[PDB]
Amino acid sequence: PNHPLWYTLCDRYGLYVVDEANIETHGMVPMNRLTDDPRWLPAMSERVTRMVQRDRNHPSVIIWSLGSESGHGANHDALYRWIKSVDPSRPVQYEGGGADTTATDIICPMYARVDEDQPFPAVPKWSIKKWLSLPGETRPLILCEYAHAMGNSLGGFAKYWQAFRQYPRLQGGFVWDWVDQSLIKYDENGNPWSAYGGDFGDTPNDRQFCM
Amino acid sequence: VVLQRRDWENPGVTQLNRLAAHPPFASWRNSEEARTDRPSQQLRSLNGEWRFAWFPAPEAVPESWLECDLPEADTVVVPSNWQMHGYDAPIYTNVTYPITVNPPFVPTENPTGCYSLTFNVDESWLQEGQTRIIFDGVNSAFHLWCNGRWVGYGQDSRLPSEFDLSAFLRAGENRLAVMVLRWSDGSYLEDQDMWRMSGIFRDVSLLHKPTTQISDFHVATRFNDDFSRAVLEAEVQMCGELRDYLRVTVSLWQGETQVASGTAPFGGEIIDERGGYADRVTLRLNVENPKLWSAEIPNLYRAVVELHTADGTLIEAEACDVGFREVRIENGLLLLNGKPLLIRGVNRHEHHPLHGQVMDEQTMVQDILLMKQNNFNAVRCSHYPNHPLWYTLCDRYGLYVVDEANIETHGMVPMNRLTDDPRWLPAMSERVTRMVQRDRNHPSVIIWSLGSESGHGANHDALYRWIKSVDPSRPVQYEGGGADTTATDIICPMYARVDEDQPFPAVPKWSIKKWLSLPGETRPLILCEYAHAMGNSLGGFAKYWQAFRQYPRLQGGFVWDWVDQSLIKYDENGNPWSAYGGDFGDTPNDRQFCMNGLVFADRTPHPALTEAKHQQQFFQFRLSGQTIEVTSEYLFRHSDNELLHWMVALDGKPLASGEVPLDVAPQGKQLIELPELPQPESAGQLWLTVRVVQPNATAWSEAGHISAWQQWRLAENLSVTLPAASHAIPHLTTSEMDFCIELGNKRWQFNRQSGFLSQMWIGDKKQLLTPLRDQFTRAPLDNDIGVSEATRIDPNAWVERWKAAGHYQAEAALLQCTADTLADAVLITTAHAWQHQGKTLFISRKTYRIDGSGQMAITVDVEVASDTPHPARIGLNCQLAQVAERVNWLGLGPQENYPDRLTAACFDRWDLPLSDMYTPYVFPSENGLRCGTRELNYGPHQWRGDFQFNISRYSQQQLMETSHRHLLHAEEGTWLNIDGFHMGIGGDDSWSPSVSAEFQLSAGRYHYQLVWCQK
Amino acid sequence: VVLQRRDWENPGVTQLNRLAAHPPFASWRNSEEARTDRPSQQLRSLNGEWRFAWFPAPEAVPESWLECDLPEADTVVVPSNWQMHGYDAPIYTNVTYPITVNPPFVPTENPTGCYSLTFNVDESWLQEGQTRIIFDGVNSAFHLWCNGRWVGYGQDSRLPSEFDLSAFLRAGEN
Ligand SMILES: O[C@@H]1[C@H](O)[C@@H](O)OC[C@@H]1O
Ligand SMILES: O[C@@H]1[C@H](O)[C@@H](O)OC[C@@H]1O
Ligand SMILES: [Mg+2]
Ligand SMILES: [Mg+2]
Ligand SMILES: [Mg+2]
Ligand code: NA
Ligand code: NA
Ligand code: NA
Ligand code: NA
Ligand code: NA
């Protein structure tokens, strides 16, 4: 969840917002170790319920999100249903555990490609055109993250837009991402320079991956 | 820290340092022991003599108690509830909380139980592995110390709390100190209608697990389309250091035969981008033609889970009983192994009249044997998870179980105040999730329940969905918020009626037949609670069973409930008596509302039990000519321990009888043609009675057990022969005050001022202590009083309508009294009006015809004002001077039966001691009636006609004036109530009028006739 | 009790004495101010200059800090991340946790930021009504004291944590 003023601004300037619970357990092995564990349900629920309680009157928020990169656990399913009872007015999405689980109203993969399948075991990233028509699948597909803009990037961006325009159920997505997470440091002459991971003696770090 | 934090006033803190929940563990270090389920040296019981001291609050507990035994403390048995030892009073309240409603706060005066145990720990236990303590049940919150060091804290009275004591224990002598709080924030979710108690009331134990251990395991069984192939899937989780040499073997045993086995290293399939569970493995075993589990045939296998090294060293074994069955809902029907269930269920609280809420094997086994002997196949854990042995026993004996989370917030306003509050979701989720984690491997549990009477809140929806993701094998039900919310797979109302709508705003109880077909509705309907068996009850029971059999989607229900919650108190002479709400100084209380059982606290049946057994029969009967059609309602078994016994009798006199072996396929039919019947000599009605008898004993019944029965009227030959003419003729004697009739030794006296037979003689011995008078009232049943809360004086209740109309204080005003002399008889004619405050309620017109034979023919015609509430009865009563040992009758019996509860009674010649003609309901009321009676014999008297009667040493007046059965005293002689007509008893619920129209005395004009004579 | 409990190593305790969550409030006492979204005199900002002192662990915080400013403390702007003031290093890691994976436990060396503010409260706030404090974002967990007395505890870095201070406040300087 963001600074309160963000929603006010999006309400007034006009931006659709996906409001996302502060839950990410990416580093767990496997990724759902905590989110499938009933002992973590209370800490998890507070992160979801207190978000909804805070932001549910903002017109800009059109979609609720259960968080990011925490696999798919039973806690997700419980919290999905909690939102659906409490606030039927907005769809709930969540990418974890394969982007098309029972905890999401929207097929919301990250970095699924337009035409090329990436058949990873358990959590494949189908071509978004193919994903739509898998046997029994009926939901819309909006990419929660796509077109990783790291450095000299965004090659093949037009391919996504052509597909979005041709397919009714391909309804767009969210680029990753808006702003480089570089921080200012100063050299000996007091001159500013953009720093990334490692430049603060931080180790282990992931270098330029923050940009 | 402990007194400062006040964890018992914070729903955010429901435990500290408590271990994860799991299925029953024993940590066998021998695989054969695991297989046979023999005792484990690694699981020790700490039950027995503990030390105990009571305190008014936790602030009053002295610090010394953490290290040293208190001298003022007593030695008590554990498990126990401390109320049962007399330390404070048990409280009986129904809806209203026993504490001020101020969540999450409890009273500053909070009864505190200080338990302590000095015990020995072997050195072997502390050298290696893990030593944990298990508390199966502590009510309602507690802190734990070991050797003076704080260990942890726990809430939820009905699930086990486990703590690791490895770092707290020393070799030799150790001391536990447990501070149990009566009230906590947990109490807001424990507002079940039952005795409010506290203490360490379930087993305490010590378990030793190795460092590398089985930490969890789940068993699933799935099938092909015709159940000829199954796959057993066992997921096993470990704790400790991961090692390549580690293996799990799961083997499946049918008796002493191993049918299947699988072994695999740890490391599950890939789950997501980060891999899989390196600490888990899933074994899949193929099973051909599995023997399926059901309540009809509780086929069980044994699964043994061995944790071991590849090269063959066993680290430990866990095990469980496995029943192969599929529970699913399809096309609106609840199916077990592909077949639609018909639930013959009952709600059962954990209650003992001496030990309170502490359960024991003997009581448990007793309860199960009685349920199965009375044709129940299902039980609901109302309203909390049970003692762990209950499930084992239900697995083994065969009963379908509804396992229910310990969540009830009935006293909240509105009922969902907490269950709709996200701040209560953690406390609620632990009560659901830890139940599921404990009981998921028991085949007997077929349905999960989210709790009881807590309205419907979003927390219910979240937790409904949690169970569905974690355990797809079982439907989830929940009644709150209208019985058909999005948090239930099954429409599960309480006390919805068969044909009658009860259209309460927001939460109506539709007629169950109507409910099924409401626009858009497709689910099955099984009543979570129906037929409230409070006192003299279960009227209209047959109406439920008729609808269950006719409608596919009406799949039965659970009677409320199994056993009266009466407790034992002792009088001045040390004699035991049954007590209910208020009898312990407890106030506010809800009195006798704790007694709704089909059986008494000591497990003696109420008469209603036989009605339940009969309606729940598994064999149905039709008769066409001399052909009996038997239909089986079993789904899985053949009738392979069943013979039909038939009997034909003429007004009680046996004319023919035989027996035919039953040979019926499940859901099938069998035709039995009776042999040619001999023609009856004398007049009267022939009756056919058939009984299904089990020739061989079973795990649950003795040889000769009667499981089903039915009766029919066959040929009737009406008597056309006139009585032989008498030589004698009775003489009248008139005075201004009396009419006296005389014939030999027999004499009758009619009082001319009152208009009733005041006396009668045989020899010169008086026969009456009170005149023969009309009676239009009964000592009100619990259903007539119709209150569920002590404070609700309801004007709509039957008792209140009768009271306000003046039925109980109406006075007979004589309208007519005349005598006449006929050729062979004296004829007395009378008329009375019954009046209250200028209003005529009833008029009774009679003729007494006494003839030369010695017989008095009483003809009664009654008018009942149409605008007065329908009377409870229309008959006569008197107090006979004679007390005899026996009562002999030709009518319905042998047990108590009323017009809406008489389907189980059989017409025959019955003969019982006088005491059996009174039913000792703890709260006394009209009782012991028998209907369809053509003849009654008591001492020298005989009555003939077509009537209903009760006979006992207690007047209707005493019964209605005495609140407890033990306070009753045998009056002089015998009170007789002979009714031409009697109102139904009702019972669909006990807090609103529940007697159906067809059983109300509303015909306005009534006629009956009786013949009184000597034998 | 606060050190002995280690509430920051227990996922069962995510807060103590925290008020319920709700949509943005200003408690306007004038309808027209509410309509126009103009400032409310019942909603005060405590943003600006606070006192701050860094510690290697919660165990290193001296008890004197509860009642008295520490001479060694610096004056810093709030809101702020203390890494952006040079007190310790910000860490950039993607997937791999910045701490050893051992739930619910954290490192014993756990950088601790001790913030304090001396502030004044209006007279009429003390006699009547309810005064709460609102922390919109605190990363990642915190205990709160007012005038030496413990108020509560809160987790989740990205939502407001609110506490009733009505009973804790005194006339003048708090
Ligand atoms: O209180 C008991 C039960 O728990 C409730 O649901 O129905 C009434 C019964 O007597
Ligand atoms: O709903 C019924 C009634 O409202 C209560 O007073 O008694 C228990 C029963 O459930
Ligand atoms: Mg608590
Ligand atoms: Mg209740
Ligand atoms: Mg915590
Ligand atoms: Na599109
Ligand atoms: Na990045
Ligand atoms: Na049915
Ligand atoms: Na009751
Ligand atoms: Na009575």
XYZ file of N, CA and C in Angstrom, chain A residues 146-211:
198
model
N 5.343 -6.690 -17.215
C 5.912 -7.060 -18.522
C 6.915 -6.029 -19.029
N 7.631 -6.381 -20.101
C 8.600 -5.488 -20.738
C 9.573 -4.895 -19.716
N 10.423 -5.761 -19.173
C 11.415 -5.373 -18.183
C 12.365 -4.298 -18.741
N 12.219 -3.076 -18.242
C 12.903 -1.919 -18.817
C 14.307 -1.671 -18.239
N 15.072 -2.735 -18.058
C 16.351 -2.621 -17.387
C 17.416 -2.162 -18.373
N 17.886 -0.937 -18.182
C 18.913 -0.366 -19.040
C 18.383 -0.125 -20.433
N 19.176 -0.521 -21.421
C 18.818 -0.391 -22.816
C 17.856 -1.504 -23.187
N 16.566 -1.204 -23.116
C 15.564 -2.257 -23.137
C 14.268 -1.803 -23.777
N 13.237 -2.621 -23.594
C 11.931 -2.454 -24.209
C 11.913 -2.839 -25.686
N 12.806 -3.741 -26.085
C 12.734 -4.350 -27.423
C 11.585 -5.339 -27.489
N 10.797 -5.264 -28.558
C 9.613 -6.124 -28.716
C 8.364 -5.591 -28.028
N 8.400 -4.321 -27.617
C 7.270 -3.705 -26.916
C 6.044 -3.636 -27.819
N 6.271 -3.303 -29.092
C 5.208 -3.190 -30.084
C 4.474 -4.503 -30.291
N 5.161 -5.619 -30.044
C 4.561 -6.941 -30.218
C 3.423 -7.169 -29.215
N 3.629 -6.709 -27.979
C 2.594 -6.736 -26.939
C 1.369 -5.921 -27.336
N 1.598 -4.698 -27.818
C 0.494 -3.795 -28.143
C -0.343 -4.247 -29.326
N 0.315 -4.773 -30.355
C -0.376 -5.423 -31.457
C -1.300 -6.530 -30.921
N -0.779 -7.380 -30.040
C -1.569 -8.468 -29.439
C -2.723 -7.962 -28.559
N -2.437 -6.978 -27.698
C -3.463 -6.354 -26.875
C -4.596 -5.843 -27.740
N -4.262 -5.190 -28.846
C -5.305 -4.638 -29.715
C -6.122 -5.692 -30.501
N -5.456 -6.754 -30.941
C -6.148 -7.814 -31.678
C -7.054 -8.701 -30.822
N -6.665 -8.960 -29.571
C -7.395 -9.921 -28.712
C -8.235 -9.202 -27.664
N -9.576 -9.354 -27.721
C -10.412 -8.707 -26.702
C -9.985 -9.020 -25.265
N -9.678 -10.293 -24.982
C -9.363 -10.736 -23.613
C -7.924 -10.466 -23.196
N -7.090 -10.043 -24.145
C -5.786 -9.509 -23.796
C -5.986 -8.029 -23.503
N -6.076 -7.680 -22.218
C -6.466 -6.320 -21.848
C -5.348 -5.418 -21.332
N -4.118 -5.690 -21.764
C -2.976 -4.836 -21.430
C -2.074 -5.388 -20.337
N -1.481 -4.486 -19.566
C -0.582 -4.883 -18.492
C 0.191 -3.729 -17.906
N 1.040 -4.047 -16.931
C 1.835 -3.038 -16.242
C 3.333 -3.216 -16.494
N 3.959 -2.228 -17.136
C 5.397 -2.305 -17.423
C 6.198 -2.375 -16.133
N 7.301 -3.122 -16.164
C 8.250 -3.084 -15.062
C 9.549 -2.374 -15.447
N 9.799 -1.183 -14.895
C 8.850 -0.459 -14.047
C 9.023 1.049 -14.268
N 8.606 1.880 -13.316
C 8.582 3.319 -13.582
C 9.952 3.981 -13.439
N 10.558 3.839 -12.263
C 11.767 4.590 -11.958
C 12.909 3.723 -11.436
N 14.093 3.897 -12.031
C 15.350 3.348 -11.510
C 15.475 3.580 -10.007
N 15.848 2.544 -9.265
C 16.077 2.704 -7.828
C 17.551 2.975 -7.558
N 18.096 3.984 -8.222
C 19.467 4.397 -7.956
C 19.438 5.457 -6.858
N 20.474 5.448 -6.025
C 20.626 6.408 -4.937
C 21.827 7.318 -5.194
N 21.753 8.556 -4.705
C 22.863 9.508 -4.819
C 23.964 9.252 -3.791
N 25.197 9.131 -4.283
C 26.403 9.216 -3.465
C 27.239 10.405 -3.941
N 28.264 10.768 -3.167
C 29.123 11.912 -3.496
C 30.591 11.489 -3.544
N 31.299 11.853 -4.614
C 32.753 11.607 -4.694
C 33.532 12.561 -3.781
N 34.862 12.481 -3.818
C 35.717 13.339 -2.983
C 35.516 14.850 -3.212
N 35.214 15.238 -4.453
C 34.961 16.642 -4.801
C 33.539 17.114 -4.490
N 32.786 16.292 -3.756
C 31.396 16.594 -3.390
C 30.397 16.531 -4.539
N 30.803 15.919 -5.650
C 29.937 15.786 -6.824
C 29.054 14.528 -6.794
N 27.754 14.681 -7.132
C 26.782 13.586 -7.090
C 26.990 12.512 -8.163
N 26.827 11.252 -7.774
C 26.761 10.158 -8.737
C 25.764 9.068 -8.354
N 25.142 8.487 -9.376
C 24.113 7.480 -9.190
C 24.709 6.148 -8.792
N 24.286 5.640 -7.639
C 24.799 4.386 -7.109
C 23.735 3.278 -7.162
N 24.193 2.032 -7.240
C 23.318 0.875 -7.140
C 23.826 -0.112 -6.074
N 23.382 -1.365 -6.155
C 23.706 -2.377 -5.151
C 25.195 -2.624 -5.043
N 25.688 -2.653 -3.810
C 27.109 -2.870 -3.545
C 27.873 -1.607 -3.191
N 27.350 -0.455 -3.618
C 28.048 0.825 -3.481
C 28.002 1.401 -2.066
N 27.364 0.680 -1.145
C 27.271 1.131 0.240
C 27.970 0.145 1.170
N 28.787 -0.730 0.583
C 29.403 -1.838 1.307
C 28.414 -2.956 1.591
N 27.199 -2.827 1.051
C 26.155 -3.848 1.206
C 26.518 -5.109 0.426
N 26.558 -6.223 1.148
C 26.888 -7.529 0.590
C 26.266 -8.624 1.473
N 25.642 -9.648 0.860
C 25.400 -9.810 -0.570
C 24.498 -8.699 -1.104
N 24.667 -8.361 -2.380
C 23.792 -7.412 -3.060
C 23.489 -7.937 -4.449
N 22.571 -7.278 -5.155
C 22.264 -7.673 -6.532
C 22.553 -6.595 -7.583
N 23.511 -5.732 -7.258
C 24.127 -4.820 -8.226
C 23.130 -3.887 -8.918
N 23.140 -3.890 -10.249
C 22.317 -2.955 -11.000
C 20.857 -3.404 -11.140
N 20.503 -4.536 -10.537
C 19.171 -5.084 -10.751
C 18.061 -4.227 -10.152
N 18.452 -3.221 -9.368
C 17.503 -2.276 -8.808
C 17.121 -1.177 -9.796
N 17.726 -1.187 -10.980
C 17.420 -0.157 -11.982
C 16.725 -0.772 -13.196
